[model samples]
Target: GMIEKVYEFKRDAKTKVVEKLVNTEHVQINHIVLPRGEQMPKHYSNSYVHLIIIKGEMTLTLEDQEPHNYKEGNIVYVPFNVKMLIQNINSDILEFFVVKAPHPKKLNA
Candidate 1:
């Protein structure tokens, strides 16, 4: 039985936790939780990422543009090989799911 249920982010935690909920050869899913004032610093990768905001106020910053405020029901996409960051501003915790495709270096290579 490889079933994992009870998908929920912890609230009492004060730090960020990017949990890999599902990982496969061609795709990946991560449950991200960032506490207030937390920043998932700018970074880049070859993978195409899609961030689906679940709750709270956040900002997505790309090196090419100003930081934009995003909230629940927003789906953000990170361009291939572009620098970006997701920050938590006014919420106790920012919860989102990151979905990446075409696998990663270690997966598809």
Candidate 2:
């Protein structure tokens, strides 16, 4: 048995959606979808983070750096404790996955 459960996002979601899809001792994963002109409130990374952009574009602002735009097929790395501001400034819908290693609790414990 090599396959586990499958995961998918809400394709017709109208508002911003953040869903934690997996959590384990070693890792965590989340699916996030942002509509145009929406954003996530500024926050700091709780663990080593990787943002895998699957659709649309992302306006990413990290601590001590200007906001940068990332398009689909891009993966952005962000370290723990860094401030992050994420937004969907494009007209197209934004969909991305967040992967954090060591789980936040294990890393912060």
Candidate 3:
């Protein structure tokens, strides 16, 4: 199967934003933009998520582990069921996209 170029989303000085680009039964793509000093809480997901940094710099922290620094052109992978956190380390906004294979079942039980 041929991969498709997904949709696009943008964020400004106000806050972070996320938009669903493309989604199929086998895969999904999303664009995320984070503003300066903004952060995403530490949480675990049901599916594996791969992030490719597009702009700015940020720190990614894993459960009980040292934070990993990432900037433009960097890539990071978060496996399912693992706790992770993200924060913008610079005054400029941080942007990234996430691609995942076969979204997993929700752990709401």
For residue 89, model 2's alpha carbon misses the true position, in angstroms, by: 0.9
In order, candidate lDDTs are 0.80, 0.89, 0.79
lDDT of 2 by residue, 52-84 (tens): 998899999998788999989999999998999
For model 2, the superposed segments whose C-alpha errors exceed 4 Å read 1-3, 12-14
Alpha-carbon lDDT of model 2: 0.89
Whichever of 2 and 3 has more TM-score, that candidate is 2
Model 3, stretches more than 4 Å misplaced?
1-6, 11-14, 106-109
Cα lDDT tens digits, model 1, 1-109, are 5575455545545578978877677777888889898888678856888999887878888887988998889998886788888889878888888999967765335
Highest-lDDT candidate: 2
Report the poorest 10 consecutive residues by lDDT, candidate 1. Answer: 4-13
Runs of candidate 1 with Cα error greater than 4 angstroms are 1-15, 106-109
Per-residue lDDT for 59-102 in model 3, tens only? 88988899888899888888878888888877488888888766
TM-scores for the candidates: 0.79, 0.88, 0.79
Give the C-alpha miss distance for residue 10 in model 3, angstroms. Answer: 2.6
Whole-model lDDT, model 3: 0.79
Worst 10 residues of 3 by lDDT: 5-14
